[PDB]
Design an enzyme around this catalytic site. Structure first.
Site, PDB file in Angstrom:
ATOM      1  N   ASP A 107       0.819  -1.211   0.000  1.00 14.35           N
ATOM      2  CA  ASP A 107       0.000   0.000   0.000  1.00 14.35           C
ATOM      3  C   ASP A 107       0.864   1.277   0.000  1.00 14.35           C
ATOM      4  OD1 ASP A 107      -2.439   1.775   0.693  1.00 14.35           O
ATOM      5  OD2 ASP A 107      -3.298  -0.240   0.922  1.00 14.35           O
ATOM      6  N   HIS A 154      -3.496   6.191   3.221  1.00 14.99           N
ATOM      7  CA  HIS A 154      -4.276   5.000   2.973  1.00 14.99           C
ATOM      8  C   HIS A 154      -3.703   3.746   3.645  1.00 14.99           C
ATOM      9  CE1 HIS A 154      -6.061   1.709   0.496  1.00 14.99           C
ATOM     10  NE2 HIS A 154      -7.120   2.493   0.612  1.00 14.99           N
ATOM     11  N   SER A 360     -11.127  -1.403   0.309  1.00 11.30           N
ATOM     12  CA  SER A 360      -9.773  -1.431   0.876  1.00 11.30           C
ATOM     13  C   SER A 360      -9.842  -1.609   2.400  1.00 11.30           C
ATOM     14  CB  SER A 360      -8.984  -0.159   0.508  1.00 11.30           C
ATOM     15  OG  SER A 360      -9.471   0.993   1.198  1.00 11.30           O
TER      16      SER A 360
END
Ligand code: NA
Length: 424
Positions: A107, A154, A360
């Protein structure tokens, strides 16, 4: 004299290296295990390179396709999504005594010093973003191997879902996670993702979480060496996944967030505004050997933004919804409690918390669960047995149809109590 980025699939490490020296090729990325490299060269040299039939398989221009549950400090009672899958926290009393499985997360990076993540953070975490980052347009990227700091935020949110163990609790609070950074401040390259998958598998992470998706163009009707589609990336990504499988790692991928039935080819092409002939695919979610995770809302219904479809979704986990926001507008949504009911509370890149939604956030729940299953039943030598246990005994059987939920919504309490069957 224009110099561009080309993705190249080669046939042999030794002959490729030799060719690189002979033509002084400027290789800017390379994954020896998959026989793929990225080379910066003129269109004239790219075309000449495609004529080396003994060494080069394909070439295409690289494109833009992408445990405290009850104290006064605990936020666990606000994590509706985590409560839903753990029988309100009861499954944390059935955790394996030893949590040896490593979860790899591919990520944006992670805030390694977040209070809820620091104990689970592994120093084996690595940076796959090259010197100068995306297409050489970010000079702050030094290519430092251990720099996995999150610039975007994120990765930190995802890591909390698998591994938070503080005010917030993840699915697998005693397992270490390893972050593989594939984002600087700009975009990612599918080749970096592929190398991250190979790295994670080589590092012994038996569960690999990929929250990044992309709609890729590939054209099986063209067999020329020099191509117009994104063949090299497609191959690199599918080969990385199969490489992980050979190394006994499971790859868990997020379904897309566009609310589309992936069997509708027309609607997929529309994601890349593509008019060729010609196919668009949601990857790696639709690839072979991946556990594809769709997202559910707080009422266990499929999230409106979750992609789905037959021969695609394998399982679903809570990822949230924006139904309330769309129904009541911003003001009422944030000030009358709705945001809290339909979004996922997770760790933020400011050392605190944030409410978000998306596949996600569902996917790390499944990755965490697989880590628990492998450790609980000692399936390290046969990780596919973990997947089958997850599918047959680790989900709710109240969710249908299969085309939307796969085997059903994740149920960690059930997954950890297969030896404790109760007669009804
Ligand atoms: Na046990």
């Amino acid at each position: 004299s224009e110099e561009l980025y080309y993705s190249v699939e080669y046939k042999n490490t030794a002959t490729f290296n030799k060719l690189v020296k002979k033509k002084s090729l400027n290789v800017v990325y390379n994954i020896p295990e998959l026989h793929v490299a990225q080379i910066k060269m003129t269109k004239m040299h790219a075309n000449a390179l495609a004529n080396y039939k003994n060494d080069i398989k394909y070439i295409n221009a690289t494109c833009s396709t992408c445990i405290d549950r009850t104290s006064n400090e605990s936020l666990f009672s606000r994590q509706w999504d985590m409560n839903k899958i753990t029988n309100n926290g009861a499954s944390y009393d059935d955790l394996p005594k030893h949590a040896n499985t490593k979860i790899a997360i591919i990520d944006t990076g992670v805030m390694k010093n977040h209070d809820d993540l620091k104990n689970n953070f592994s120093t084996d975490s690595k940076n796959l973003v090259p010197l100068n980052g995306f297409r050489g347009t970010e000079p702050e990227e030094t290519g430092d191997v251990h720099d996995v700091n999150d610039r975007k935020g994120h990765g930190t949110m995802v890591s909390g879902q698998t591994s938070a163990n503080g005010k917030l609790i993840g699915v697998a609070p005693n397992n270490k996670f390893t972050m593989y950074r594939v984002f600087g401040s700009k975009k990612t390259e599918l080749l970096w993702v592929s190398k991250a998958i190979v790295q994670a598998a080589n590092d012994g992470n038996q569960v690999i979480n990929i929250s990044v998706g992309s709609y890729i163009i590939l054209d099986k009707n063209d067999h020329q060496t020099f191509r117009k589609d994104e063949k090299v990336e497609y191959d690199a990504l599918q080969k990385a996944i199969n490489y992980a499988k050979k190394k006994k790692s499971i790859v868990v991928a997020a379904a897309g967030n566009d609310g589309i039935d992936v069997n509708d080819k027309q609607k997929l092409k529309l994601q890349r505004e593509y008019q060729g002939n010609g196919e668009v695919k949601d990857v790696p979610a639709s690839m072979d050997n991946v556990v594809t995770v769709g997202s559910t809302d707080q009422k266990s219904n499929l999230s409106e933004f979750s992609n789905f479809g037959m021969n695609y979704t394998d399982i679903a986990a809570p990822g949230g919804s924006f139904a309330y926001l769309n129904q009541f507008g911003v003001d009422k949504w944030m000030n009358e409690g709705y945001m809290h009911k339909e979004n996922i509370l997770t760790t933020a890149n400011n050392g605190r918390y944030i409410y978000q939604a998306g596949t996600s956030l569902a996917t790390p729940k499944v990755s965490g669960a697989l880590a628990l299953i492998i450790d609980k039943y000692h399936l390290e030598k046969h990780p596919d047995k973990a997947i089958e246990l997850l599918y047959q005994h680790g989900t709710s059987k109240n969710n249908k149809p299969f085309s939307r939920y796969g085997h059903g919504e994740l149920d960690v309490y059930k997954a950890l109590n297969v030896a404790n069957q109760k007669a009804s």
